[PDB]
Symmetry: D8
């Protein structure tokens, strides 16, 4: 699918809504996808170091 319902917490929601209020982002979804890319890149690196050594 394309939609996901997530338990964020009140503080992290306040953070997301702040990034949207600033105007650097358009929707809460754009903030969440930006965060996912950060974790994805971090995860990819470690997995790259694993395939390389091997």
């Amino acid at each position: 699918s394309r939609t996901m319902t997530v338990d964020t917490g009140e503080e992290l929601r306040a953070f997301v809504e702040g990034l949207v209020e600033s105007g650097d982002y358009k929707t809460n979804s754009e903030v969440i996808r930006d965060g996912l890319r950060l974790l994805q890149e971090k995860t990819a690196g470690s997995k790259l170091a694993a395939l390389r050594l091997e």
Copy 2:
């Protein structure tokens, strides 16, 4: 405290892969890990610093 988000199918696949690995328990835990990363990057950035020295 629930949020509904448009991930698309590739980033949902990525999230469900990390949960599948077992280092995370729920999809929500993956999302919060990513937002903690984004909060730290935001607070550390030069833009946040430039925006505070308009005091």
Copy 3:
């Protein structure tokens, strides 16, 4: 306003459409905003170094 029409070039459009095809981004607009944030952060740094020295 909120909409802007830009001359991109065929190659850079191909780049944008590739990032969307990968799924890491949803619309061409999300790609353009991500790029703007990079330049914005870069610009902010240099301006921060100017106010600091002064």
Copy 4:
């Protein structure tokens, strides 16, 4: 080769500020500068490298 993009008002203000400074000639030049940055960041990233070693 034209594209229509939803910037929002703050990032349009930012672009028009850079053109106003004179280091850039058109709004389009600002957008292309940002996409060149994003292309370089993409090509250099660890994700692009991990994605190529599935050959």
Copy 5:
């Protein structure tokens, strides 16, 4: 998949402080975040590399 751990009172205070902040949901989420950090540090270390080249 439950584990019982001796934290002492200061590191329990630290964990409960992070949950209190709201960036985490459960004490368990804090522990798993720390173990993910430790796993990444272990895999990246020079000791793990030296230990693999006894193949």
Copy 6:
């Protein structure tokens, strides 16, 4: 108190028990405390950057 019961997951438990098996650590608890110190130091840094700017 001093004792805490945590939901780890089978994979992360396998990781802890591997570090103990190696001998670099004595108990599962020593592994968990080492991990907490890493996150604690990481958290302290960001909080230090906040008090400093202010």
Copy 7:
């Protein structure tokens, strides 16, 4: 706001190659990109800092 510059043939070839690639629209855009780089390098340098503390 036009300037006439002696590039030589190799650096003209380089510029026209970058325009040919499509990441740039005009020769002028390439020149301005390079001058933006040079301005940033100048402002960041230790010489610019040493020259300001003769105030």
Copy 8:
């Protein structure tokens, strides 16, 4: 050929003429060539990373 006419803008011309006034450079052309070398080196790096991975 060897000569090129470029639209610089009033501010970037002021920048070039400032570097010449300082004496670190002799002609506007020397400033422009120095800038080109910076972009050229930057471009070469990324292209080197492309041939290397491949």
Copy 9:
């Protein structure tokens, strides 16, 4: 065996007992093992650089 008696010095003992008092560590032994891991990692690196060049 598993137990070792070591001449530490009064100052370094005061250091160990301070890390325990802080609560980040449980026993003097946990402090000593943490220190050993640091030296062990440092030693491993140099030995890795030796096998690699060779």
Copy 10:
């Protein structure tokens, strides 16, 4: 000024290996080298800095 410590067998093997190499004279010298490293890491850390600015 003597301390009795539970090393386990692997870290005792490591210590006795370093003494065996000859760069160290006694097991105690290895332990003190490690504690000097830990003291330097502690003093340099961000936690020690954050803990001092509660003055």
Copy 11:
């Protein structure tokens, strides 16, 4: 004045003439001025560190 006669050596002259042959530079003088700026920036840094500490 503006002109200086310098004892370079045959090898360093060969180096200068190579940078000119490549086309990245126009005259031997442009190469020498580029080198002077490098040493000048290096010298400025150390002198900046001296005024700062004081």
Copy 12:
């Protein structure tokens, strides 16, 4: 092995200042120091590397 070079007055002032300091003996020694720096920067650069892999 002599070369005649157009320095301009500011970079001649800089050279004669370094000789005046005493860390250098002749103007020529300053010029050679700068060219050694430029040779090292050239050999180390990414352009020199990209230019060699057209073999």
Copy 13:
């Protein structure tokens, strides 16, 4: 395995200061710590690498 060394008075003062601090037990332990540093610096250096590729 004893060596007699000319330290001069300032570096003897430095050594005896470190022993006085208590992080070291004997003057000899200070000397060996310094030689371990020098051995690591030597093995890691570019000179040691250049000298090995004359094989």
Copy 14:
């Protein structure tokens, strides 16, 4: 005084005598003083960080 008798160990003596044999150093004493300067600089740094924070 100026002379010190130290227990080095056979391996570290072999190291010192190797650095002398290479010719980069003249006497065993020059090797020992070079090592002391390394530890001295390392010690000074940490002590500098202590006076600075305070």
Copy 15:
């Protein structure tokens, strides 16, 4: 302003090799280049900084 120095044969070979390369004119120029490096390293070091804050 002349100094007589005990180099040993290997470091004399090294100096004469650099002069032979042509990047330097005299043995003295090599010695001064090395002393300029040592002066910069000394001024930049943490020891020089610690020694000044006893004012």
Copy 16:
């Protein structure tokens, strides 16, 4: 041979004699050899980068 007579300059001699006065060095010759090792290591690196690429 083993002895070399060098034109240093009054300022660089003052520098050498200062390092000797501090006590970190014993003779002017020890200072000169320390400086040579710095340049030697710097030279070796660049030559290593040349053999490696080739």
